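Researcher: Next entry: multidrug resistance-associated protein 1 (Homo sapiens).
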Amino acid sequence: TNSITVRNATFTWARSDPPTLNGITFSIPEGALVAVVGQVGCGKSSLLSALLAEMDKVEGHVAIKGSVAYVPQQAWIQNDSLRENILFGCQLEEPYYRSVIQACALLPDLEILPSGDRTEIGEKGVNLSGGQKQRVSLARAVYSNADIYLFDDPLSAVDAHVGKHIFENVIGPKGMLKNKTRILVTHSMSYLPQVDVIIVMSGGKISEMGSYQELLARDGAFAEFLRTYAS
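Model: Predicted structure:
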């Protein structure tokens, strides 16, 4: 079965404006790990917004099976304790909470905060770095335990060694989220060999879709992208 099904779908940010995503068609099997790559401006971030129903659908079919969590690049933080930023309404449950803390590599952060996870962060609180903010934001999503995770370059501000650990512990084939549907928008080539399927976008359309090895041998859009544009 498919957790996400999109058919001939077109989206715009405003009815007055030309559509940003044109004739999108793809299906994502439940449990798949998917990367969506392409040049800046290719529509890959908007694709997540479209699935969250944050654009205007002009035509097409979108079917989403399950709850959805979103982890945006621009991690945001509410003016509250670090703990409350993760718990986000939900009740504290152990050992799930500390499992999430550890996997999102927050332990070294907690160890230098004035009150561990009780520390007030945000305006009014302690100044967290962008990387610290992304770890907290990812922890919040992981703790919600959704069926579908939409990631938009969620570790772009995180140290590369730590990001590796986070990908392995949370996002990848052996992470806490290994049974979830995961859609990873990224401009990095680093973890592409590990995903199940890659969707290559250009001009708000899908150029090609396949595994890393398939697309790499095809020597078309993905190959170009890896060669010339990928970080």
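Model: Note for the record: The chain is about 30% helix and 30% strand.
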